[PDB]
Amino acid sequence: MRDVVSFEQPEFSVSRGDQVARIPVIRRVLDGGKSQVSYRTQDGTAQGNRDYIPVEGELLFQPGEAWKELQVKLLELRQVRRFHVQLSNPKFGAHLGQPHSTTIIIRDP
């Protein structure tokens, strides 16, 4: 498979006070053209509009592009909560690699 798109890790840890989770997505084995995948947050114990700002959209990789950083906003309110991000719907010859979902662990300062 070429143009394989994945999260770099299955889990990331962030402090709530950081205001943003910076989530890396990579594309490997580039064939030379564009690739697209969809992405979406999904609540776990962290909930949209309470713990973070939900987002969904498309990641369009132009020729040569090997990574992106998603930025999901974190909201301020011992405590640990998690939300998820999922890749789906590869287009233009893209494929999903492992891991194609990830968990963002929000910890207190």
JSON list of C-alpha atoms in Angstrom, two decimals:
[
{"chain": "A", "resi": 1, "resn": "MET", "atom": "CA", "xyz": [0.00, 0.00, 0.00]},
{"chain": "A", "resi": 2, "resn": "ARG", "atom": "CA", "xyz": [1.10, 3.56, -0.80]},
{"chain": "A", "resi": 3, "resn": "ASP", "atom": "CA", "xyz": [0.09, 6.90, 0.70]},
{"chain": "A", "resi": 4, "resn": "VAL", "atom": "CA", "xyz": [-0.58, 5.31, 4.07]},
{"chain": "A", "resi": 5, "resn": "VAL", "atom": "CA", "xyz": [-2.00, 7.77, 6.57]},
{"chain": "A", "resi": 6, "resn": "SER", "atom": "CA", "xyz": [-2.03, 7.19, 10.34]},
{"chain": "A", "resi": 7, "resn": "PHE", "atom": "CA", "xyz": [-1.76, 8.84, 13.71]},
{"chain": "A", "resi": 8, "resn": "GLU", "atom": "CA", "xyz": [1.76, 8.63, 14.94]},
{"chain": "A", "resi": 9, "resn": "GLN", "atom": "CA", "xyz": [0.74, 7.02, 18.25]},
{"chain": "A", "resi": 10, "resn": "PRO", "atom": "CA", "xyz": [-2.35, 5.35, 19.72]},
{"chain": "A", "resi": 11, "resn": "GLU", "atom": "CA", "xyz": [-2.25, 7.67, 22.74]},
{"chain": "A", "resi": 12, "resn": "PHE", "atom": "CA", "xyz": [-1.14, 11.20, 23.48]},
{"chain": "A", "resi": 13, "resn": "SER", "atom": "CA", "xyz": [-1.07, 12.95, 26.84]},
{"chain": "A", "resi": 14, "resn": "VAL", "atom": "CA", "xyz": [-1.77, 16.67, 27.28]},
{"chain": "A", "resi": 15, "resn": "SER", "atom": "CA", "xyz": [-2.31, 19.02, 30.20]},
{"chain": "A", "resi": 16, "resn": "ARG", "atom": "CA", "xyz": [-5.70, 20.64, 30.31]},
{"chain": "A", "resi": 17, "resn": "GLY", "atom": "CA", "xyz": [-3.97, 23.94, 30.89]},
{"chain": "A", "resi": 18, "resn": "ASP", "atom": "CA", "xyz": [-2.24, 23.76, 27.49]},
{"chain": "A", "resi": 19, "resn": "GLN", "atom": "CA", "xyz": [-5.40, 25.01, 25.75]},
{"chain": "A", "resi": 20, "resn": "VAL", "atom": "CA", "xyz": [-4.67, 22.77, 22.73]},
{"chain": "A", "resi": 21, "resn": "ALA", "atom": "CA", "xyz": [-3.82, 19.20, 21.88]},
{"chain": "A", "resi": 22, "resn": "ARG", "atom": "CA", "xyz": [-1.34, 18.99, 19.03]},
{"chain": "A", "resi": 23, "resn": "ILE", "atom": "CA", "xyz": [-1.93, 15.63, 17.31]},
{"chain": "A", "resi": 24, "resn": "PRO", "atom": "CA", "xyz": [0.43, 14.38, 14.62]},
{"chain": "A", "resi": 25, "resn": "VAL", "atom": "CA", "xyz": [-0.79, 12.57, 11.49]},
{"chain": "A", "resi": 26, "resn": "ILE", "atom": "CA", "xyz": [1.74, 11.07, 9.10]},
{"chain": "A", "resi": 27, "resn": "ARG", "atom": "CA", "xyz": [1.64, 9.92, 5.48]},
{"chain": "A", "resi": 28, "resn": "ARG", "atom": "CA", "xyz": [4.12, 7.23, 4.46]},
{"chain": "A", "resi": 29, "resn": "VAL", "atom": "CA", "xyz": [5.20, 5.52, 1.19]},
{"chain": "A", "resi": 30, "resn": "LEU", "atom": "CA", "xyz": [4.32, 8.46, -0.97]},
{"chain": "A", "resi": 31, "resn": "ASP", "atom": "CA", "xyz": [3.29, 7.67, -4.54]},
{"chain": "A", "resi": 32, "resn": "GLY", "atom": "CA", "xyz": [3.65, 11.32, -5.64]},
{"chain": "A", "resi": 33, "resn": "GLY", "atom": "CA", "xyz": [0.14, 12.70, -5.72]},
{"chain": "A", "resi": 34, "resn": "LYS", "atom": "CA", "xyz": [-2.45, 14.10, -3.36]},
{"chain": "A", "resi": 35, "resn": "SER", "atom": "CA", "xyz": [-4.22, 12.07, -0.68]},
{"chain": "A", "resi": 36, "resn": "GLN", "atom": "CA", "xyz": [-7.23, 12.80, 1.48]},
{"chain": "A", "resi": 37, "resn": "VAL", "atom": "CA", "xyz": [-8.71, 11.28, 4.62]},
{"chain": "A", "resi": 38, "resn": "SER", "atom": "CA", "xyz": [-11.49, 12.39, 6.89]},
{"chain": "A", "resi": 39, "resn": "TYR", "atom": "CA", "xyz": [-11.00, 12.96, 10.61]},
{"chain": "A", "resi": 40, "resn": "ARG", "atom": "CA", "xyz": [-13.34, 13.38, 13.56]},
{"chain": "A", "resi": 41, "resn": "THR", "atom": "CA", "xyz": [-13.18, 13.71, 17.32]},
{"chain": "A", "resi": 42, "resn": "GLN", "atom": "CA", "xyz": [-15.37, 11.46, 19.47]},
{"chain": "A", "resi": 43, "resn": "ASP", "atom": "CA", "xyz": [-16.12, 11.83, 23.14]},
{"chain": "A", "resi": 44, "resn": "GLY", "atom": "CA", "xyz": [-14.84, 9.36, 25.72]},
{"chain": "A", "resi": 45, "resn": "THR", "atom": "CA", "xyz": [-14.96, 10.47, 29.34]},
{"chain": "A", "resi": 46, "resn": "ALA", "atom": "CA", "xyz": [-13.85, 13.89, 28.00]},
{"chain": "A", "resi": 47, "resn": "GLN", "atom": "CA", "xyz": [-16.88, 15.53, 26.47]},
{"chain": "A", "resi": 48, "resn": "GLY", "atom": "CA", "xyz": [-17.25, 18.04, 23.69]},
{"chain": "A", "resi": 49, "resn": "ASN", "atom": "CA", "xyz": [-18.03, 21.57, 24.88]},
{"chain": "A", "resi": 50, "resn": "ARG", "atom": "CA", "xyz": [-17.03, 20.68, 28.42]},
{"chain": "A", "resi": 51, "resn": "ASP", "atom": "CA", "xyz": [-13.47, 19.33, 28.11]},
{"chain": "A", "resi": 52, "resn": "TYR", "atom": "CA", "xyz": [-12.58, 20.11, 24.50]},
{"chain": "A", "resi": 53, "resn": "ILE", "atom": "CA", "xyz": [-13.98, 21.65, 21.33]},
{"chain": "A", "resi": 54, "resn": "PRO", "atom": "CA", "xyz": [-15.06, 18.95, 18.90]},
{"chain": "A", "resi": 55, "resn": "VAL", "atom": "CA", "xyz": [-13.89, 19.07, 15.29]},
{"chain": "A", "resi": 56, "resn": "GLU", "atom": "CA", "xyz": [-14.28, 17.10, 12.13]},
{"chain": "A", "resi": 57, "resn": "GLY", "atom": "CA", "xyz": [-12.97, 17.71, 8.67]},
{"chain": "A", "resi": 58, "resn": "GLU", "atom": "CA", "xyz": [-10.73, 16.58, 5.86]},
{"chain": "A", "resi": 59, "resn": "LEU", "atom": "CA", "xyz": [-6.95, 16.24, 5.72]},
{"chain": "A", "resi": 60, "resn": "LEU", "atom": "CA", "xyz": [-5.82, 16.99, 2.18]},
{"chain": "A", "resi": 61, "resn": "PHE", "atom": "CA", "xyz": [-2.17, 16.08, 1.69]},
{"chain": "A", "resi": 62, "resn": "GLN", "atom": "CA", "xyz": [-0.62, 17.82, -1.27]},
{"chain": "A", "resi": 63, "resn": "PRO", "atom": "CA", "xyz": [2.19, 16.18, -3.21]},
{"chain": "A", "resi": 64, "resn": "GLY", "atom": "CA", "xyz": [5.28, 15.78, -1.02]},
{"chain": "A", "resi": 65, "resn": "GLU", "atom": "CA", "xyz": [3.45, 16.45, 2.27]},
{"chain": "A", "resi": 66, "resn": "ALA", "atom": "CA", "xyz": [4.45, 13.82, 4.89]},
{"chain": "A", "resi": 67, "resn": "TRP", "atom": "CA", "xyz": [2.64, 15.02, 8.00]},
{"chain": "A", "resi": 68, "resn": "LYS", "atom": "CA", "xyz": [0.05, 17.29, 9.57]},
{"chain": "A", "resi": 69, "resn": "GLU", "atom": "CA", "xyz": [-0.64, 18.50, 13.07]},
{"chain": "A", "resi": 70, "resn": "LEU", "atom": "CA", "xyz": [-4.25, 18.55, 14.19]},
{"chain": "A", "resi": 71, "resn": "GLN", "atom": "CA", "xyz": [-5.04, 21.13, 16.84]},
{"chain": "A", "resi": 72, "resn": "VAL", "atom": "CA", "xyz": [-7.97, 20.36, 19.05]},
{"chain": "A", "resi": 73, "resn": "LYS", "atom": "CA", "xyz": [-8.84, 23.07, 21.59]},
{"chain": "A", "resi": 74, "resn": "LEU", "atom": "CA", "xyz": [-8.99, 22.10, 25.23]},
{"chain": "A", "resi": 75, "resn": "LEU", "atom": "CA", "xyz": [-11.25, 23.72, 27.75]},
{"chain": "A", "resi": 76, "resn": "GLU", "atom": "CA", "xyz": [-10.60, 24.53, 31.37]},
{"chain": "A", "resi": 77, "resn": "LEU", "atom": "CA", "xyz": [-13.18, 23.60, 33.97]},
{"chain": "A", "resi": 78, "resn": "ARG", "atom": "CA", "xyz": [-6.50, 14.25, 40.29]},
{"chain": "A", "resi": 79, "resn": "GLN", "atom": "CA", "xyz": [-8.67, 14.36, 37.17]},
{"chain": "A", "resi": 80, "resn": "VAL", "atom": "CA", "xyz": [-8.06, 12.43, 33.96]},
{"chain": "A", "resi": 81, "resn": "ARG", "atom": "CA", "xyz": [-10.41, 12.36, 30.95]},
{"chain": "A", "resi": 82, "resn": "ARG", "atom": "CA", "xyz": [-10.08, 10.98, 27.43]},
{"chain": "A", "resi": 83, "resn": "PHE", "atom": "CA", "xyz": [-11.43, 11.71, 23.97]},
{"chain": "A", "resi": 84, "resn": "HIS", "atom": "CA", "xyz": [-10.68, 10.02, 20.66]},
{"chain": "A", "resi": 85, "resn": "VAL", "atom": "CA", "xyz": [-9.81, 10.97, 17.11]},
{"chain": "A", "resi": 86, "resn": "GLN", "atom": "CA", "xyz": [-10.61, 8.76, 14.14]},
{"chain": "A", "resi": 87, "resn": "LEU", "atom": "CA", "xyz": [-9.48, 8.69, 10.52]},
{"chain": "A", "resi": 88, "resn": "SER", "atom": "CA", "xyz": [-11.86, 7.41, 7.83]},
{"chain": "A", "resi": 89, "resn": "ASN", "atom": "CA", "xyz": [-12.85, 7.71, 4.20]},
{"chain": "A", "resi": 90, "resn": "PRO", "atom": "CA", "xyz": [-9.53, 7.64, 2.35]},
{"chain": "A", "resi": 91, "resn": "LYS", "atom": "CA", "xyz": [-9.63, 9.18, -1.11]},
{"chain": "A", "resi": 92, "resn": "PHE", "atom": "CA", "xyz": [-7.37, 9.74, -4.11]},
{"chain": "A", "resi": 93, "resn": "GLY", "atom": "CA", "xyz": [-5.54, 6.47, -3.53]},
{"chain": "A", "resi": 94, "resn": "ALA", "atom": "CA", "xyz": [-4.86, 7.00, 0.19]},
{"chain": "A", "resi": 95, "resn": "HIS", "atom": "CA", "xyz": [-4.90, 4.13, 2.66]},
{"chain": "A", "resi": 96, "resn": "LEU", "atom": "CA", "xyz": [-5.28, 4.09, 6.42]},
{"chain": "A", "resi": 97, "resn": "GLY", "atom": "CA", "xyz": [-2.46, 2.70, 8.44]},
{"chain": "A", "resi": 98, "resn": "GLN", "atom": "CA", "xyz": [-2.07, 1.69, 12.06]},
{"chain": "A", "resi": 99, "resn": "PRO", "atom": "CA", "xyz": [-3.12, 3.37, 14.26]},
{"chain": "A", "resi": 100, "resn": "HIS", "atom": "CA", "xyz": [-5.99, 5.05, 12.48]},
{"chain": "A", "resi": 101, "resn": "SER", "atom": "CA", "xyz": [-7.58, 6.09, 15.71]},
{"chain": "A", "resi": 102, "resn": "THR", "atom": "CA", "xyz": [-5.98, 7.67, 18.74]},
{"chain": "A", "resi": 103, "resn": "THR", "atom": "CA", "xyz": [-6.82, 8.60, 22.34]},
{"chain": "A", "resi": 104, "resn": "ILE", "atom": "CA", "xyz": [-6.05, 11.99, 23.82]},
{"chain": "A", "resi": 105, "resn": "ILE", "atom": "CA", "xyz": [-5.59, 11.85, 27.59]},
{"chain": "A", "resi": 106, "resn": "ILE", "atom": "CA", "xyz": [-6.28, 15.17, 29.29]},
{"chain": "A", "resi": 107, "resn": "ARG", "atom": "CA", "xyz": [-4.58, 15.50, 32.69]},
{"chain": "A", "resi": 108, "resn": "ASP", "atom": "CA", "xyz": [-4.77, 18.21, 35.35]},
{"chain": "A", "resi": 109, "resn": "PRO", "atom": "CA", "xyz": [-1.73, 20.38, 36.04]}
]
